[PDB]
Design a protein around this ligand. Structure first.
Ligand SMILES: [Cl-]
Ligand SMILES: [Cl-]
Ligand SMILES: [Cl-]
Ligand SMILES: [Cl-]
Lengths: 171, 171, 171, 171
């Protein structure tokens, strides 16, 4: 590489693995989105929430791939595993699966940051802090707020609660 | 006819029968609309949903009658049967009767398309695909989404659910 | 299904397979796009052409998934195979791989249309004609025009030709 | 100093050396700019590219000097060595000398970041990440893209290639 400088093979490979994780997350959210569009599920605000997250995760993948080429690394794509479920249950089940997925992405970001720290790669550490770590903390906080509101609404009238959350929060 | 070309007597008669079905559907929705305007029913969003569908079905009838004259067929009107009920029950009952009515219209459209295919009438087949078959699929999907949301809201507090659906979805 | 009408299990499964093909094509074009962004390839107009096609194929996947739910079918996602190459060669090599990929998508569309014809599913046949078959013919024609111009420019000065095509056609 | 806090003498001196490096780089690019303005070189887009970089490096010097005073360090200026050549050859030669110069600046930035890490100076580490390390990665990537395009255009008609790159990329 004519440009590569202070860019370890370890970080280059970890960045490719992180792109895979972000594209798998995007695929998971595409499945969640279309599940909530089923005529027998029919929660449009939940459809929109997850389709928006499919787009945001594809953006994170593309940002990583841009940075890989800016550093002189080589993008390598792997197969994208299908999402973990075909049917996603209630909005509560879906939001629980989403926060588990985002905690796994956050841990992957923190692991890559630690690798960049170990490799003395301050551009990598800046890139993640600037475009990923705060976005991920913000999203996980929003999902926790949603989980608490969804849980508050179950009580003994779960259908009513699920409708109201979709109508009055995800509108 | 100076203009008629590739237009079977079978399709001409089936088009007149379809006009009757669309005008009967329009009449059914006029009855549903005014039922939800009763002072002892009083669900304005449900009134508006069905009155809108009365207008849409009259538009479909008029589109068919325009096409009948464009092809050189002769419009023939029959008596319009009164709607199947005088009182329509709950919003759930009404939406169930609506989806049954729309499935019957869709089947009539598919039967006419099959006749046009059998008669090698590609203008007829184009006309239905372009102005009816996707509109009908879209409407039946919307009605299924509404049925699922209405059913979710019954639980043990049916009046509350019926109010909320009218206020928060059909607004 | 409360809504499903005239929608075969055969078409439902073929639509899921077509979604997989479109998402694999989108992934292939994401790889092509980022290959042309490498500092040792550096053809921005070729980057933009393929990244645009990644977006267009994701749109086709999403249109199919929307239609699957409008018909009352169930979206089912499979693993997404990685693209067929890690490195894509010259713009000529890349455009040849793209036209092969688009001919394979077109054949899949034609196969699904034939299935819908065999199943007497005119909504499916309309949907494909309206949103896919002409878009695919148009794209394959554009790729053929590009292949001819790329081939005209090789002569004995291939680097010069590859630069000029990127600067003067894909600008 | 009434203001100085957590600011090592080692970082203060390294910042003065980095200012010298940035002003020497600015001087080098002023020479490159005016070389491409010679009547017997006459490549205006190459003139503009290097004169723009002379301005950008002077901006980096001024940013460093501002930060030195914000931290309570004392700016110290040294003689500015003349650029390494009087005549810069072809656009390829010039772009090769530029990427070598920028790799040397990047290494100086990384060395200063490592010093700030060793001295536990997070303001310094933030300052460099925020205003220098990504700008430098971006510039080196652009220069690599240019080198690849310049090299593609040499073939057996070097004058033609050099003209075309200036006209169609550096316009
Ligand atoms: Cl799997
Ligand atoms: Cl009667
Ligand atoms: Cl594979
Ligand atoms: Cl000297």
């Amino acid at each position: 590489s004519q440009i590569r400088q202070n860019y370890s093979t370890e970080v280059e490979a970890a960045v490719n693995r992180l792109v895979n994780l972000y594209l798998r997350a995007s695929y998971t959210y595409l499945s969640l989105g279309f599940y909530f569009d089923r005529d027998d599920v029919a929660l449009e605000g939940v459809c929109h929430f997850f389709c928006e997250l499919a787009c945001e995760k594809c953006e994170g993948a593309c940002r990583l791939l841009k940075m890989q080429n800016q550093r002189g690394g080589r993008a390598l794509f792997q197969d994208l595993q299908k999402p973990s479920q075909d049917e996603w249950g209630t909005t509560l089940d879906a939001m629980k699966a989403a926060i588990v997925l985002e905690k796994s992405l956050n841990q992957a970001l923190l692991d890559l940051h630690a690798l960049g720290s170990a490799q003395a790669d301050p551009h990598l550490c800046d890139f993640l802090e600037s475009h990923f770590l705060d976005e991920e903390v913000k999203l996980i906080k929003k999902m926790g707020d949603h989980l608490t509101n969804i849980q508050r609404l179950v009580g003994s009238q779960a259908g009513l609660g699920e409708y109201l959350f979709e109508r009055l929060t995800l509108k």
